[PDB]
Amino acid sequence: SVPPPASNPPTDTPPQPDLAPPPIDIPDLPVVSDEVAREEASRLAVLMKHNVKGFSTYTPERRKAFLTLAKDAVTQADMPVSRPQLVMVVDRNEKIQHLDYVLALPDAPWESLGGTPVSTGTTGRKYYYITPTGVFQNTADRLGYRAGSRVWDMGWQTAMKGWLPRHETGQIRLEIHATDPQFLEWRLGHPASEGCIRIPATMNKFMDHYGLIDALYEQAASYDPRFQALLPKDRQPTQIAGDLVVVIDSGPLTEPKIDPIAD
Ligand SMILES: [Cl-]
Ligand code: NA
């Protein structure tokens, strides 16, 4: 069977004239040397190994695929890498279904930290979408919410309907969700979502506490009480925090498949 769909409510940040800060009041994102960045990435990698269920470093061939396709995608999206920063790379291929944290460096080869199984969107089921490839940024344009378990809201995105071989797109609210009583952790590693990205509950808490993709969220929390209120009070944000979630597809690109029971 396929688990029921997650709820993916939009969380666009309302405009507030009273919170508009001058440039000096918005802190700059931390910039560390490549030497410091690599040491911090190694520390975080060891912590994830011992605190996130299902964590793995990958084989050399798999690491190369994560690193090459993620760099390819960021380059094609013309998104700049001007400081050492983490990137969450998700391989939606039906045969992989894993994420890899990568350290992007502006003037040196990127480095792989490791990651966990995930579940992205499945084919063959009406109203379930294939998770789209591309570069998705976690910005202060959205708040996300807490289920509490953190939910990251990546905005409306064009996605391919998973049940129509003719290739027909629609709009999904792309979000990152932990596992829960209706989407159990043993589902991870095979496609089973309606289009969202499911991650282990412990990976969700780790990302929340260390702020791995929350660089722009933390920046906004400096002056905006709505972002401050959603972030954990006991967090310990890493200086190499990033903001990009990059969905790749390494094998033959996912093709939709008919749902034999759809009318
Ligand atoms: Cl389940
Ligand atoms: Na998918």
Numbering used by the authors: 54 to 200, 216 to 331
The study reports:
Here, we identify an LD-transpeptidase, LDTGo, that generates 1,3-crosslinks in the acetic-acid bacterium Gluconobacter oxydans. LDTGo-like proteins are found in Alpha- and Betaproteobacteria lacking LD3,3-transpeptidases. In contrast with the strict specificity of typical LD- and DD-transpeptidases, LDTGo can use non-terminal amino acid moieties for crosslinking. The YkuD domain of Gox1074 includes the putative catalytic cysteine (C264) and histidine (H245) which are conserved throughout LD3,3-TPases.
A high-resolution crystal structure of LDTGo reveals unique features when compared to LD3,3-transpeptidases, including a proline-rich region that appears to limit substrate access, and a cavity accommodating both glycan chain and peptide stem from donor muropeptides. The structure was solved by the molecular replacement method by using the catalytic domain as predicted by AlphaFold2 (AF2). It is worth mentioning that the region comprising residues 56–86 (referred later as the “belt”) was not properly predicted by the AF2 model and was manually modeled into the experimental electron density map (see Methods for further details). LDTGo contains an elongated and unstructured proline-rich N-proximal region, spanning until residue 86, which we will refer to as the “belt” for reasons we explain below. In our crystal structure, the belt wraps around the protein, forming up to 11 hydrogen bonds, various van der Waals interactions and inserts into the catalytic cavity of the YkuD domain. It is noteworthy that Asn61 from the belt is making hydrogen bonds with two residues located at both sides of the catalytic Cys264, the catalytic His245 and the Glu262 that is part of the acidic patch close to the acyl-donor site. Thus, the obtained crystal structure of LDTGo likely represents a self-inhibited state in which the belt occludes the active site from the peptidoglycan and blocks the catalytic residues. In the crystal structure, the capping loop is disordered and the L247-252 presents a conformation in which the Phe251 traps Arg266 from the active site through a cation-π interaction. Another distinctive feature of LDTGo is the presence of a long loop connecting β3 and β4, Lβ3-β4, that includes a unique triad of in-tandem Tyr residues (Tyr180, Tyr181 and Tyr182). In addition, in YcbBEc, there is a narrow groove that extends toward the catalytic Cys residue, whereas in LDTGo, a large and open cavity is observed near the donor site with a pronounced acidic character.
